[PDB]
Amino acid sequence: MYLRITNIVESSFFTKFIIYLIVLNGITMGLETSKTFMQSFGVYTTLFNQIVITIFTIEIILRIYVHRISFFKDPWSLFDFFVVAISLVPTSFEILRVLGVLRLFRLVTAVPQMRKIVSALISVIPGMLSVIALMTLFFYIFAIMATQLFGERFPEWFGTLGESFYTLFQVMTLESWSMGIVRPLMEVYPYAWVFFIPFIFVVTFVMINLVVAICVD
Amino acid sequence: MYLRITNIVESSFFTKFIIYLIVLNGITMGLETSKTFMQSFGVYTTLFNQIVITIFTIEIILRIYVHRISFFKDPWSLFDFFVVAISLVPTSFEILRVLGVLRLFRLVTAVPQMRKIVSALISVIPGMLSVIALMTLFFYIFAIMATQLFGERFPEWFGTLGESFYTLFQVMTLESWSMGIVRPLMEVYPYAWVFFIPFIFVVTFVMINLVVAICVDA
Amino acid sequence: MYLRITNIVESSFFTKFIIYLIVLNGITMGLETSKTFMQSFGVYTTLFNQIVITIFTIEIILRIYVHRISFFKDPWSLFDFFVVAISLVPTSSGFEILRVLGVLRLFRLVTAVPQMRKIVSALISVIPGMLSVIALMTLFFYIFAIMATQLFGERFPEWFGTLGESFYTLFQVMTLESWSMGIVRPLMEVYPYAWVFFIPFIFVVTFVMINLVVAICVD
Amino acid sequence: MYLRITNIVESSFFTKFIIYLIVLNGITMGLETSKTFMQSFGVYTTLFNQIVITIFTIEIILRIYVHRISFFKDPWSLFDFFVVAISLVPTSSFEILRVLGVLRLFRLVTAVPQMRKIVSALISVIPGMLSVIALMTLFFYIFAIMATQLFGERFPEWFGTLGESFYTLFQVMTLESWSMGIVRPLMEVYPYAWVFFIPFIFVVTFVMINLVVAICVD
Numbered sequence: 001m002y003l004r005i006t007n008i009v010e011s012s013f014f015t016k017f018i019i020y021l022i023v024l025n026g027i028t029m030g031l032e033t034s035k036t037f038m039q040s041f042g043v044y045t046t047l048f049n050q051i052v053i054t055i056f057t058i059e060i061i062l063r064i065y066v067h068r069i070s071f072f073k074d075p076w077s078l079f080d081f082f083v084v085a086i087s088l089v090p091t092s093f094e095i096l097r098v099l100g101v102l103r104l105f106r107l108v109t110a111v112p113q114m115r116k117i118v119s120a121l122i123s124v125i126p127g128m129l130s131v132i133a134l135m136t137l138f139f140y141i142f143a144i145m146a147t148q149l150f151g152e153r154f155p156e157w158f159g160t161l162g163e164s165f166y167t168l169f170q171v172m173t174l175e176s177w178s179m180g181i182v183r184p185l186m187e188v189y190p191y192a193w194v195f196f197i198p199f200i201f202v203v204t205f206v207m208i209n210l211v212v213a214i215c216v217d
Numbered sequence: 218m219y220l221r222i223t224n225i226v227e228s229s230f231f232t233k234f235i236i237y238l239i240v241l242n243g244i245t246m247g248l249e250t251s252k253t254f255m256q257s258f259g260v261y262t263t264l265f266n267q268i269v270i271t272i273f274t275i276e277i278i279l280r281i282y283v284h285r286i287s288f289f290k291d292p293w294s295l296f297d298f299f300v301v302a303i304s305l306v307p308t309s310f311e312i313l314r315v316l317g318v319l320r321l322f323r324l325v326t327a328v329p330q331m332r333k334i335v336s337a338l339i340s341v342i343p344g345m346l347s348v349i350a351l352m353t354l355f356f357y358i359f360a361i362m363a364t365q366l367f368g369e370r371f372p373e374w375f376g377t378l379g380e381s382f383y384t385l386f387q388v389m390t391l392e393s394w395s396m397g398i399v400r401p402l403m404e405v406y407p408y409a410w411v412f413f414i415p416f417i418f419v420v421t422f423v424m425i426n427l428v429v430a431i432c433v434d435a
Numbered sequence: 436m437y438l439r440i441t442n443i444v445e446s447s448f449f450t451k452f453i454i455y456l457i458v459l460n461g462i463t464m465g466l467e468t469s470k471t472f473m474q475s476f477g478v479y480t481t482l483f484n485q486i487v488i489t490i491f492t493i494e495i496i497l498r499i500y501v502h503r504i505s506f507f508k509d510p511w512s513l514f515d516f517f518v519v520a521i522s523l524v525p526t527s528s529g530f531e532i533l534r535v536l537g538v539l540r541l542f543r544l545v546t547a548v549p550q551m552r553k554i555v556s557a558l559i560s561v562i563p564g565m566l567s568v569i570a571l572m573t574l575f576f577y578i579f580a581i582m583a584t585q586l587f588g589e590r591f592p593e594w595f596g597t598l599g600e601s602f603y604t605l606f607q608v609m610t611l612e613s614w615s616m617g618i619v620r621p622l623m624e625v626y627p628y629a630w631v632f633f634i635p636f637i638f639v640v641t642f643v644m645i646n647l648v649v650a651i652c653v654d
Numbered sequence: 655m656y657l658r659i660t661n662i663v664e665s666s667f668f669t670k671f672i673i674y675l676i677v678l679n680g681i682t683m684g685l686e687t688s689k690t691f692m693q694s695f696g697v698y699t700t701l702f703n704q705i706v707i708t709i710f711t712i713e714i715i716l717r718i719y720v721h722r723i724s725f726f727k728d729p730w731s732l733f734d735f736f737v738v739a740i741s742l743v744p745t746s747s748f749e750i751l752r753v754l755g756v757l758r759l760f761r762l763v764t765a766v767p768q769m770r771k772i773v774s775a776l777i778s779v780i781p782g783m784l785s786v787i788a789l790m791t792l793f794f795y796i797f798a799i800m801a802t803q804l805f806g807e808r809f810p811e812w813f814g815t816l817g818e819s820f821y822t823l824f825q826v827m828t829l830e831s832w833s834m835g836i837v838r839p840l841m842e843v844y845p846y847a848w849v850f851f852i853p854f855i856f857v858v859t860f861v862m863i864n865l866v867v868a869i870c871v872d
């Protein structure tokens with residue numbers, strides 16, 4: 001019976017079908033948003049999710065036996081598997097349902113062309129780790145400082161290695177960094193800009209290089 | 218009578234005179250802006266609009282007879298047709314009068330060099346369709362996620378897949394995303410930062426490669 | 436006697452000396468910022484300023500005769516010339532902003548200096564390959580600045596009361612600065628579909644902005 | 655004794671050990687961030703800091719005698735030297751050195767190699783920019799000067815001093831709340847103020863671009 005089921009999972013019919021449910025549950029998950037709607041046909045819908053999830057589980061279960069050890073070294077179906085397993089994680093923390101919406105990323109898994117444009121991006125990740133690790137330590141060394149400078153008067157923003165990491169990141173984005181965060185800060189600590197215009201130059205400079213680093217390909 | 222209009226239509230003056238009329242009315246419509254202007258000379262103007270509106274029909278009719286099928290596979294001319302039809306609709310939704318202003322774009326269509334710099338731009342879109350579509354899926358899988366997260370206390374921003382799409386887009390543009398959206402939210406949802414800091418990395422990450430792609434895809 | 440003064444103007448030191456005065460006027464203009472400075476040394480200071488402008492007119496005049504028809508074919512010296520002439524114009528006859536643009540003669544630093552003359556000149560050469568684009572933008576702006584004004588100028592005169600205000604506001608949206616909270620979401624209170632206007636504009640104007648650089652790393 | 659400390663300094667483990675200890679106090683200082691932590695094992699900590707502060711003194715003294723002048727031509731070792739002396743300077747009587755004590759966590763880049771590199775790569779890009787930077791600085795200067803004696807009158811918070819102007823300009827340069835926050839206000843009082851800031855913005859933005867392509871060209 002082994003060679004029987006082998007024909008099912010990868011038929012032209014199957015993949016398009018899994019894809020189909022994906023776009024469907026994709027849609028279906030997009031409708032499960034409307035409140036007007038659910039009072040009319042809400043039940044009609046909710047079933048289909050488990051359906052897709054079960055099929056996607058069947059798909060995910062089938063995809064398992066035929067490949068055996070082969071299924072468990074691929075990002076995509078494991079993705080789907082999580083995406084399915086997440087989506088399989090029973091209907092009641094509640095985000096699995098939500099990450100169940102990632103099962104609409106199974107669209108990325110079940111559909112070609114998507115798989116490619118995705119993998120093309122990642123190939124760039126390796127050349128940046130040198131830079132990223134720098135950033136995280138860089139942010140961290142600063143997450144330590146901001147906290148023990150500005151946590152005095154500004155506990156919302158720099159009270160915590162957490163909040164300082166947050167607020168710093170926001171300044172990195174240059175979002176309300178001045179009017180929203182620094183000009184306030186400078187009211188209490190007249191010399192704060194010596195921390196931030198540099199933080200801004202530095203992190204501004206670095207981020208750029210990472211890109212030139214990218215345009216190495 | 219066939220071969221008559223073809224030399225007119227394909228004449229240097231034709232190209233140059235159509236272009237002439239455009240620049241005329243482009244000015245004219247920047248004038249239809251002043252209220253100061255219209256209660257005095259509204260008459261003189263509105264007419265010239267119906268005037269220009271008419272000639273360009275001839276041109277399009279002439280260019281139609283002259284190219285026949287050659288015209289309606291011409292983006293530049295196809296555009297022309299549409300951007301013409303809009304302005305002809307009678308004088309009273311009132312937005313059409315306004316869309317009547319789009320007619321200043323045939324200036325891109327009718328003038329050489331313009332057809333070209335634009336075509337250069339559009340031609341890049343094919344290398345992007347893959348990404349946009351991913352984004353759109355990404356945004357959607359996420360506007361879905363955000364909406365089935367934040368619409369209770371924050372119906373203004375995330376009440377609808379729409380405002381979520383919008384807000385996400387707004388967050389995407391990075392305009393007031395933290396002080397304005399994440400920090401309020403965090404007044405109520407302390408770990409909201411785990412949703413938006415990643416969406417921000419990803420939606421940003423993706424946008425990046427896309428540009429080196431352009432500079433690299435050449 | 437012509438070649439006498441001619442050899443002088445083009446001396447290594449002359450070049451070295453004009454460059455010098457620029458930096459002087461550069462600084463002296465920088466201390467007239469402090470009221471402390473002036474209430475002590477308003478006398479001491481203001482006097483020193485007429486000195487340089489005349490000299491810079493002199494250089495400009497010398498550079499004129501020594502070069503004749505050639506001087507007013509020199510941007511830098513013309514710059515200088517105006518920058519000097521700008522800097523030359525009297526202290527009260529009209530509007531009072533002229534005293535200041537003399538500070539552009541501190542751009543004469545860019546004019547008198549060789550390595551600076553260059554880096555500045557390096558930037559400019561990029562322009563020929565882009566003119567194609569800016570003009571499209573400029574047009575693009577015009578076509579949109581027009582629409583917004585006769586759309587949102589009824590209710591939003593601060594931002595869109597005038598084709599001017601619209602250009603401004605459109606420009607602001609372009610930078611994505613407070614574009615949503617500050618402008619689009621407001622608009623949307625009265626005109627609910629405005630996002631259909633701006634998301635594309637934001638889509639398009641941003642797009643155009645991108646291609647223009649690849650063109651640069653192409654030139 | 656000359657040769658005794660030499661194998662230690664350039665040994666794999668010493669390198670790994672200093673490197674190791676770095677990760678320790680780094681964690682330790684990251685815990686010196688938590689107010690929570692300091693009252694239980696702060697002793698364990700504040701002490702361990704002198705522990706770390708003392709051990710690391712050995713290393714630099716070792717590396718110095720071992721390298722003598724070879725030490726003070728190593729940017730990387732010089733930093734090591736500089737960033738240590740700071741951590742040694744006492745607890746009283748402006749209090750920020752204590753805070754600067756946290757910079758000794760950058761030695762993780764120095765003692766470790768591929769970090770020494772990524773740093774040098776970024777730095778290497780900088781020289782092709784001095785021509786630019788200097789212009790900026792001059793440009794800013796010619797412009798920061800102009801602004802202060804204009805708007806320090808009605809808007810002294812932003813432009814009362816050549817300094818606040820520099821700050822505000824860089825803020826305008828970074829484009830944060832530059833419009834709603836600064837120019838539109840200015841225009842309520844100085845109707846034509848808008849003529850100054852769009853140019854600084856084009857230019858200073860312009861300059862910044864070349865600097866990238868200048869970089870992406872280098």
